[PDB]
Amino acid sequence: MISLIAALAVDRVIGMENAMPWNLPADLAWFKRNTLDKPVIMGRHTWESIGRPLPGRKNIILSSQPGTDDRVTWVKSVDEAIAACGDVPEIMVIGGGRVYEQFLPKAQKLYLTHIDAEVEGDTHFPDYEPDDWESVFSEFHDADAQNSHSYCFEILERR
Template identity: 40%
Template sequence: MISMIVAMGENNAIGKDNELLWHLPEDFKYFKKTTMGKPILMGRKTYESIGKPLPGRENIVITRDKTFTADGVTIVNSIDAALSASQQYDEVMVIGGASFYQQMLPMVKRLYLTLVHQTFDADAFFPDINEDEWVETERREYAADERHAYNFSFVTLDRTVERTG
């Protein structure tokens, strides 16, 4: 199963200048717990913003740059190659960035969303989803506190309509 994990603002904002727009420690814990032991697929810019392979997960970086190299990650040049490199796993996690989310969304069966209840100035956005194709299976609400500047929710959506093409 192909899944996607993303934190986004109310306006689908996910980043600016290749950086996250917020610091939510509980979201970092959620990301780690949800992705641990699973292959994570990401675009090159997302990998470069992280700066190193994430431990406990097979890191697969997709890039059109055939000269790109990085230690401790699997580098592929196509979506087919990325899926082939992770086919032995029950769940594969797409972790960004914006253009990779756009390309992969039609293939995704589950979305793990962190919805940050604020709008943000951004240059990277998560694509709009057709809500008729998804059902909410889990939601947890969190209030802003001394460690979290914004209210946020963890929401899991499962696709109810099979995509064709």
């Protein structure tokens, strides 16, 4: 089963040049809870940002180029990614843009973070038709002393 996970600002904006101007430790927690013990697939850019492997999870890196770091698994194609995951009950795709795109249609589940933030980004989440998905969980949280903005958690299942 394939599930995408992402943080969306206003207008399906997921990224820009510089780091997103926002502090949401709570988001990282959910991210963490939701992906631990699951293999995670990502792109070269994404991986470059993180800088290290995520622990408690299997990192598969979808890339055309040869990777040196041996602590992660390098792959060249979508099939391979999957193949590299084994017989698990859920594969989590973590981005960025291009991967979300490619894996989007094979996805069956969406964990999404909708952050009330208006920014001018380069990369956007993919467009999916609401029609086709079913909200199974939703939860709003206001900004606070530790989170710079309010946000809402959501889990969409493919209809």
